[PDB]
Structure formats: C-alpha cells, structure tokens
Write a protein that binds this DNA or RNA. Structure first.
Lengths: 88, 39, 96, 49, 137, 183, 463
RNA sequence: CUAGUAACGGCGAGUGAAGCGGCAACAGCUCAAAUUUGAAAGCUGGCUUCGGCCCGCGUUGUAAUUUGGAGAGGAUGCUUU
C-alpha cells in the first residue's frame, strides 16, 4: 500500500530459542548413553536393526502421535545404531 | 603420482532424469505397488 | 546536500554521556528555575587511599616512567593491571 | 581433547583475591578503631595463659 | 501373491485419506463419510501444515498407497481438496464450496459399502483435457 | 554444572536408570505416610527452578493423591489437591510451589516446596519476603499457584477471552446494566 | 610525485605523514589519481609494491567526502584471499583512518560469526573481508550494504586459485552495481581473472602494469634444507637454534601476526633478544626496526611470511620457515633465492612435522635438491616447565598464547596445499603443548537420496 | 462506542464476544539453567561489659554478577557515588 523506506533491524537475541549450543548437544548425547532407552525406543531399535523401517515408523507414529515426531525419533535411533556399529 | 609440483591433486540414486512439460528438470521415482503389508 | 539518502542528517546539530544531558518577558518562576539550575556547583573530587598512594609511590621508585615495565613487574604489581590503567592512576596521583 | 567452554578465563583466576582484600581492609579499619584485638603468635598466647 | 485382488487383470489401486490440522466438524464428517465408500482407502488425520507438501508422498509410501485425498483446511472455515497420484502422477487442487454430509437427516436413501459404484461422468469430461485428467483421477 | 545433566535425565522418564529409580522410590513412598516431610528434594533441578533454596525456612513435603475421576470429572487438578492437603497439615507455612515426582497405578506423588514466613532468614531476604505479606495466606486455596493459574485460564489471547481476568468478574461485568445520569 | 601534490583531505595527509610515506611507487602514482576521478581500475601489480594504499586512499576519501556514519552501513568492501592478508590491510586501514570518524572492520573465515554479525549490524563503513565469510554475512545476516560505492578485489589470482570462483560470482550478483567503482588487482592474467573483470568491472577499464619481467624462477640452482621435528618440541628446537646461532643473522617466518606478537613477548620474558615485525604496530616503528636489523652485525628478526613478502630481504645467514608456507612455490623459489644471497651462501631451513613429509615428495617432483638437518635430543634447551608456569601465571601471556594458537590452527586450516598440510592430521594437544598449554584450548577445526515425490521449485519467494 | 455485530443454536425461544478507535491510570522487575574457586565471600540462633565471641545451617550450593528486544569476559577512555 503506502510507500515507506524499510530499515534493516537489529538481530533479535530471542531468535533460535532452541539450541545451536555445542554443550547442550554434548549433555544430551552423554545422558542418552548413561540413561539407556525406553521400551518403545528399544522396540523401534530392534525393528530398525532388522531392516523393518516401515513397521518402525508406524510403531513410533502410533506411540508418539505425530508423523514428524516419529520421523525425528527414528532418525535419532538410526544415528544411535550408526555410532554403536562404529564403536563395535 | 602428482603431476603439478605445488598444487593439490585434483579430485544409490532413486530418481530418473526426465524433461518436463515446460522444459526444465523432472524427477521420476520408483513406482509404488499397492501390496498390503504384513503389519 | 544528502549524498546518502539519510532521514537523520537534517536532525543532527558511538558513546554519549550517561549520567546527564548536555543541553546548550518570561515569568519570574521560570527565570528563577533557570537561575537555580544554571548556578555553579562543586564537584567533590574523589581522592585516593593511603595504600593506593603507597603502591603507586613504590611503583615509581623502581621504574620511574616506564609504565610498560611496571605492568610487566609481578612483584610490585600483583594484580596484573595494564600500563594504561597505571598511567591513569599515576596522573591522578600527580606522579606522572 | 579440548574443554567444552571456549569462553575466556576471567583475570580474577590469575591475580590475588579481591574479596579477601576487602575483608583484610575491613579488619584493618576494625583494628584501627580498637574494636578487635590484633595478631599475637600462638606461643605468646600459650605463655600468657 | 498378497495383492488382495482376485481377478484376471488386477487394478492395484490404494487411496490414503488424510485431513489437515484445522479441519471442522463438517470437514471431518465429510472425511468419514467419503472414506467409508472406499475399501481400498486408509484413514488418518492431523497432517502437519508447516511440513512440506511432498512429505505426503512419503506418508503414502508407508501405507503402500498410490492415491492421496487430502483435506486441507484454512482459517478453520475453508476446505481445499488435493487429489494426487503419489509417485510421479499429476496433482489436482480443488476448493469445496457447499457441504452436506451423510449425517444430514433429510436424504432418506442409503447404499452398501464397497459396492462397485457406477461412475457417472459428464460429456465435458472428454471435450477438455483438464477435465479428462480430473475424470481419470 | 550438574543440574543441566539432571534436567536432561528428568526429560527421559522411561529410560532404564530413571524407570528403575522411580519404581524403587514409589515402593518406599507407598509404605510411608500420605503426607510426610522430605529431608531434601528427590528432584533438586526441578525444585531449584521452582524457587527452592537450601536455606532455613524452606521445607519439602511429599504427598500421595488418589488418581482417577470423581462420569463427572473433578475440574480440580490432582496437583491442586496435593498442595491443599499439605497446606492444612502445615498451616503455618506458605505454599510456594509443587512438582510431580512419581506416579503409581492408584496414586500420583507430588513434592510441595513450602516457605516459613516467620523465620528471620526469609523475612530479611527481599527475594522471598513478598510471601510474608498477608495477601499470600493460603495461595493454594485461591488458585494462586501454578496449577491454579493454569486451571483458571489466566493466559493472553483470543482463546482465553472469558477467563484471562477472572471468569466470574468478566461475567459480572458483561451482565451489568450501566445507566448513566444523562440518558 | 609526492603525497602532498594531490588535494587530499588534511586528515588523510596527516595520517600518511605519521606512517612516514612521502614518496610513492609506480602503482600508487598511477592508480590513486584515476581512482579519485571515479574510474574503475584494472591492475597488474604484485604484493609489496604498495597497492594497499593505492586502493585504500580512494576508499577513505570517498567515505570522508560523502560523510559516512555507522548507521549507513558499508561504503567500501575490500575482498582478500586469506585472513592474514585481510588483517594486514586492516592494520593499514586502522593507520589510515586515525583522524577519520568513519568505521573500519574485518570479516574473516575462522572467527566468531555472532560477534561479526553484531559488528556488521552496528555498522562498518570499510569492510575488509574473506569471500566465504563475506558471502555468508551478505546472505544470512541483516546489515546495510545498500550504499556501496567502492568494491576492491585484491589478489584475484590467488582467490581464483583457492576456489572462490562461484563465491565471487554470487558476491558480484548480490552487491549493488549502480554508482559502484571497482578496482581489481592480480599479479597474473588468466582466463578466470578476465572473466571476473568482465562480470565485476564496467565496460571501460583502465589497465595498469607494474611488474618485473625478469622473474628468475629457475628450478636447478637451489638448495632447501629441512628439519623433521614433532609438534610438541617445535618451538623448543627453534629456541635452542635461536640461542645457538647467536652472533648471526636469522630471519624467522611465522604464519600469523598474533603468533609473532605472542612469541615476541615470550622471548622478551625468556631472555632471548629478538626484533618483531607484526601488523599491530605503527608503520614507522616497523620501518625503523627493519632498518635497524638491516644495518646490524647480528640479531634475529621475526615476522610473518606475507608481511615480509613485500620486503627487501638483506643478506642473512639463516632463513627459517617455522610455520607452513602460505605460498609454497613462491616460498621455495623466491625465498630460497633471497636466502642464498649475493655473497657467501646462506641457508633456508624449513620446519616439518612428521605428518607433512609429502612436501618432500613435491620437492622430488620439482627437482629441487634437499638437505636434511638432524639435531641431538640432549642439546635441546628444555624450558618447557618454565614456559608452562609463565602461561599459567601471566594473564597477558595466556591471552597471547590462546590467540596465537587459534591463529595458527585457522591459518593451517585455510591452506592452499591441503594434502600436505591437513588440520585433521594435526595433534592439537602436542601443538598446544608447543604453545605452552597443558590442555589444548577449544577451537573449531572445520570453521544420499532426494525426497520422495520432490520436484524442483519453480516459484515463490524465500528470504 | 465496537454491538445486539461476528459466531453458535428444537436456526424457535434465543444465546452472544473480541481486535481496532476515544479516554482514565500508567512502572517495571526477581529467579533457574555459569566455577567465587586466588580463598562460603552468605545466613538463623545463644552469650554478652554491646565491641565481638561461640554453636549451628549450608558445597546434594548460602552471597556477588546475569535474565534473550538481553548478557558475560577482556581492552579502553570518559562519566557517576
């Protein structure tokens, strides 16, 4: 509508209120190994180690409630499988 | 076997390359068969 | 002229003074308020402690004017202060 | 192999303590007002008592 | 042979019936009433709006489906319908205007469930290529 | 330091370590009294982020609450019932906050951080002595804790139109016939 | 022609007078008057002629004449290949704007991205940048670059050699073009340099040639000595060398200015007298120090290899390359020729770790005779415990050690010969022990299938 | 005032807001997630000749610093009690 000269704004410190911090990633990874897995996470990991990815995604979706949360959990457990094989 | 004495030595696809209707790039993936899963 | 289209260049007259402003017929109360706001005041210049003067004195008695050597000195300057800070403290003490 | 924090180390970890300096100056002010008793080495306290 | 079709030549067709997040009671009722007519259709709901559009093909790959019928809802009032062949086929986006579901109590008729329906097209469904693509979808 | 790790651990409550520890503690709490004094918080990260301090005048109290419906559902939260029962046992204390610590098949266990308003360590601290004022007498009974703030719908937005300033005050404002002098 | 002849501003004249420069080279005298007239400049000068002032005088004059402010963003952008060249130009620009109210800043790959983002958001009038980080800040950070009037591209042959071709293509595409004066410099003239001059500069350039035609790059009359030393003892060996080759002339080359400053303070405390040439001092101090070293019977001068690239190297007994060379071809040929000398032959020693020995294979391919220098283990003066106590107790030396360690790691990471010098093969604990640390400080070494049903995007706006 | 509007409803009885706009009044802050680590620097009690002495709480964290349209650490030079 009306013409005004747009400004470039100062970078918001509230932007990315999640974590790009390496220390929180370190703490999250260490706790995962120390604590272990949930029973449903162990079932998903035993399906993923057998190559049954479709069943794993359906089980995760059923027990989490969203396809995005299921995808994120399946990627996390696949990453855990990858580092476990690398350590093996 | 390096040829130039002081330079750095030079150094699972699921789609198909097909021309689209407009003339750019179109990707053709593996077709889905409607076979019912065991689960 | 406005070489760069700046809306603020007509407004002019990165650190500013923080604790005050630098501001540059009528009713009698207004004139009295200006007079009492414009009258000169004292400053109460902050002095230095005896131990700080002794520290700056001992620092001068060994190096004289080499403020870089005084900063390097670990024995006589335990808090490893920068030569600029010690020079400022010497200037405030009048020990140059 | 490296620390997790890349933050700088504060200068306070390389210079003598400032809290103890304030405490010692408070004690010096207390001795000068005679409020507290000065230092006597323990053998003096043993031979006095 | 797990095709679940017993015939001479099999018409392997599977539909994935899906609804968005902000659907209404009317849109949900239309979803339930339309998915009841399709035996080869699977019902799921609450697809994530912020997610990409092609992720619907990944959701269909999970259920071995080659058709998706998407119920996109905008503002909690507007219904858009997506008819798409999943791997590489065309997509038809539609807007649904006036809805009258099966729960409406004035219709006085009813039919079986999975009875192979006679698909009655219009004569404009061959005299225009876009209506031909819609017709075949 | 360690509280970041404990927060990340508390976020995995079905993992082996946390599941094992929760079951052993649930067994012990089941065989204790319904409302019993806890020497220290079992979840120090959670208590610390809710305002608990290891200072004289701060008290933890563990409480078990029978879970389930009251098909009439109790519009009061089980966490609110916990704070009210503890607030009556410790009628000289002010309920600061509370948090979930455990759950069983028939009970849900919560820990309530309380504050003594008559201790001199609390009355001298400007960060907590607001609770010494008599307007904070029995905050759990008037919906003034966290559960009370959630159950009363005290949020900003169009979704909370009838409850953001009080439901009954809004209803009284909308049902009042205002007649001015010049009509 | 002298610097007082042109009608520069009085602030710029005073700054150049303080530097001590009263006479120009050919490239300054032939580039500054046309560039002050607003004409784009194509150059053929090498490193060390004085091209830095030749592109910094018109930028400073433009910034002062248009009265730029920190709220106006970038006015001039100087793109450099490496971070140490950018830091040298930043030191020169800091000396040039001593009286100018305009701001100046550096943006280099390997530094803090968030601190650089805040620096760019506050407003940097003259921006000396590295292409990858400049492109990253131009694409993902909010800062004002709409008032750009000067784009200087410096040493374009090296930037096209490293592989920043597509980065500069996107940089020129992003940057505003109308009323922008472009000045591009390159010591050679390739097809990629011609392509860059075609996309960047306007249809009418001005082509200026200041280059010696008699380059003596013969591959037979040379002899390069090397010493194989592990990382954790490297400096110790140098210290022993610098205490055993006293009463001699030694030039030592380091990769960064920060490590030169750290080792200067370190050798001041560890009672070994040296002379330092790093880009954090006054130009006058540096010229006087180099003049004093050039007219001395003995002594050792420590400096950066890129800082002494444009320096008249005198007759010295030893030329030591302590850090990896930035330009290995230039190092071998030209630095070996300046090490051999006009009179009785000096020697050029190179410090090699036992993970960069493939350089020797390169010396096998170039047919350059090599000489191996070994050292006894018992003749190394072990001052490691004193060094660690000094680093642990002195806050200024700890800061300098951290800065030198970070600068060494980043310069090693941004290396042209990544096969010979790879940061991933470096043991950070040992090199930090060489710098004087018990534990290595934290640094960043670095700094399938397409989606099912996904067809390429054909519309929409992404910011 | 919006406004008996939107919205919901044996779409009957009816029920029934909110943003903007004008006004009254206006005021902003405290923690948790950091190692004070070159010095628990913090606090409740008791004894008092009232000035400073003991026991205890507390390191499973009491002071100071910081609260994301922020902040810290160094450097820097002015300005404040």
């Amino acid at each position: 509508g009306h013409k005004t000269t747009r400004r470039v704004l100062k970078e918001r410190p509230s932007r990315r209120k999640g974590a790009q911090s390496k220390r929180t990633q370190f703490v999250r990874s260490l706790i995962r190994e120390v604590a272990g897995l949930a029973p449903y996470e162990r079932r998903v990991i035993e399906l993923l180690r057998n190559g049954k990815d479709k069943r794993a995604r359906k089980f995760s979706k059923k027990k989490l409630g969203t396809f995005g949360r299921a995808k994120r959990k399946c990627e996390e457990l696949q990453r855990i499988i990858a580092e476990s094989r690398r350590a093996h | 076997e390096i040829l130039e004495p002081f330079v750095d030595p030079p150094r699972d696809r699921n789609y198909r390359i097909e021309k689209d209707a407009n003339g750019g790039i179109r990707y053709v993936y593996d077709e889905i068969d409607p076979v019912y899963d065991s689960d | 002229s406005e070489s760069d289209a700046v809306p603020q260049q007509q407004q002019q007259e990165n650190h500013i003074r923080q604790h005050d402003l630098e501001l540059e017929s009528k009713p009698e109360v207004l004139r009295a308020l200006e007079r009492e706001a414009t009258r000169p005041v004292e400053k109460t210049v902050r002095h230095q402690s005896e131990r700080e003067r002794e520290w700056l004195q001992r620092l001068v008695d060994k190096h004289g004017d080499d403020v870089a050597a005084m900063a390097r000195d670990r024995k006589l300057n335990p808090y490893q202060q920068t030569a600029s800070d010690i020079k400022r403290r010497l200037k405030k003490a009048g020990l140059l | 192999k490296m620390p997790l924090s890349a933050a700088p180390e504060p200068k306070r970890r390389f210079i003598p303590s400032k809290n103890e300096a304030k405490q010692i100056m408070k004690l010096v002010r207390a001795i000068r007002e005679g409020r507290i008793l000065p230092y006597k080495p323990p053998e003096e306290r043993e031979r006095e008592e | 042979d797990r095709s679940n079709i017993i015939a001479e030549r099999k018409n392997k067709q599977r539909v994935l019936v899906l609804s968005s997040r902000g659907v209404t009671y009317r849109h949900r009722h239309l979803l339930n009433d339309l998915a009841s007519m399709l035996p080869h259709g699977r019902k799921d709901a609450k697809f994530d709006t912020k997610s990409r559009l092609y992720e619907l093909c990944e959701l269909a790959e999970l259920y071995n489906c080659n058709n998706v019928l998407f119920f996109e809802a905008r503002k909690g009032k507007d219904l858009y319908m997506w008819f798409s062949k999943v791997p590489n086929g065309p997509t038809v986006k539609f807007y649904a205007q006036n809805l009258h579901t099966m729960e409406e109590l004035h219709f006085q008729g009813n039919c079986l469930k999975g009875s192979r329906p006679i698909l009655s097209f219009d004569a404009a469904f061959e005299q225009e290529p876009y209506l031909k693509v819609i017709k075949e979808l | 330091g360690a509280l970041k790790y404990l927060e990340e651990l508390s976020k995995k409550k079905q993992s082996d370590v946390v599941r094992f520890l929760l079951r052993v503690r649930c067994w012990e709490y089941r065989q204790l009294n319904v409302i019993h004094r806890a020497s220290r918080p079992s979840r120090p990260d959670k208590a610390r982020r809710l305002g608990y301090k290891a200072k004289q005048g701060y008290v933890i109290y563990r409480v078990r609450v029978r879970r389930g419906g009251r098909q009439l559902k109790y519009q009061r939260s089980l966490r609110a019932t916990a704070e009210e029962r503890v607030g009556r046992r410790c009628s000289n204390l002010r309920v600061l906050n509370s948090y979930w610590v455990n759950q069983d098949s028939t009970y849900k266990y919560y820990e309530v951080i309380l504050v003594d308003p008559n201790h001199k360590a609390i009355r001298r601290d400007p960060r907590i002595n607001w609770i010494c004022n008599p307007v904070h007498k029995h905050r759990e009974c008037r919906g003034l804790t966290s559960t009370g703030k959630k159950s009363r719908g005290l949020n900003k937005g169009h979704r909370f139109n009838k409850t953001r300033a009080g439901r009954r005050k809004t209803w009284k404002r909308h049902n009042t016939l205002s007649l001015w002098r010049y009509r | 022609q002298e610097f007082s002849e042109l009608n520069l501003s009085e602030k710029t004249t005073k700054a150049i007078a303080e530097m001590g420069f009263t006479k120009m080279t050919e490239i300054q005298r032939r580039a500054i008057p046309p560039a002050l007239a607003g004409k784009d400049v194509l150059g053929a000068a090498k490193t060390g002629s004085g091209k830095t002032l030749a592109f910094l005088i018109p930028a400073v004059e433009m910034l002062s004449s248009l009265r730029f402010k920190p709220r106006n963003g970038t006015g001039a952008i100087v793109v450099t290949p490496t971070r140490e060249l950018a830091l040298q130009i930043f030191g020169v620009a800091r000396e040039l704007m001593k009286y100018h109210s305009q701001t100046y800043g550096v943006v280099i790959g390997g530094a803090n991205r968030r601190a650089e983002a805040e620096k760019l958001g506050k407003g940097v009038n003259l921006l000396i940048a590295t292409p990858g980080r400049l492109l990253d800040h131009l694409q993902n950070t909010p800062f004002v670059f709409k008032n750009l009037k000067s784009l200087i591209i410096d040493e374009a042959d090296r930037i096209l050699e490293i592989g920043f071709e597509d980065e500069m293509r996107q940089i020129v595409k992003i940057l505003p073009k109308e009323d922008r004066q472009t000045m591009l410099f390159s010591a050679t003239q390739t097809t990629k340099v011609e392509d860059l001059a075609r996309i960047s500069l306007r249809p009418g350039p001005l082509y200026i040639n200041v280059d010696e035609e008699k380059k003596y790059s013969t591959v037979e009359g040379l002899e390069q000595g090397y010493v194989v030393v592990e990382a954790d003892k490297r400096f110790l060996l140098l210290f022993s060398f610098l205490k055993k080759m006293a009463k001699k002339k030694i030039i030592v080359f380091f990769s960064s200015c920060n490590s030169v400053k750290y080792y200067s303070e370190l050798l001041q405390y560890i009672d070994l007298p040296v002379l330092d040439l790093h880009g954090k001092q006054k130009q006058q101090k540096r010229t006087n120090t180099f003049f004093e070293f050039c007219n001395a019977k003995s002594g050792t001068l420590i400096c950066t290899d890129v800082a002494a690239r444009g320096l008249d190297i005198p007759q010295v007994d030893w030329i030591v390359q302590f850090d990896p060379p930035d330009d290995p071809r230039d190092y071998i040929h030209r630095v070996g020729r300046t090490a051999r000398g006009n009179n009785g032959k000096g020697r050029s020693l190179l410090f090699l770790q036992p993970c960069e020995l493939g350089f020797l294979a390169h010396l096998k391919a170039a047919k350059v005779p090599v000489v191996e220098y070994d050292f006894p283990k018992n003749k190394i003066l072990n001052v490691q415990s004193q060094l660690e106590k000094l680093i642990s107790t002195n806050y200024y030396l700890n800061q300098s050690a951290k800065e030198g360690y970070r600068s060494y790691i980043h310069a090693y990471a941004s290396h042209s010969l990544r096969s010979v010098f790879d940061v991933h093969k470096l043991d950070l604990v040992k090199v930090a022990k060489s710098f004087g640390f018990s534990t290595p400080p934290r640094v960043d070494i670095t700094l399938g299938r397409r989606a099912y049903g996904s067809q390429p995007r054909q519309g929409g706006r992404y910011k």
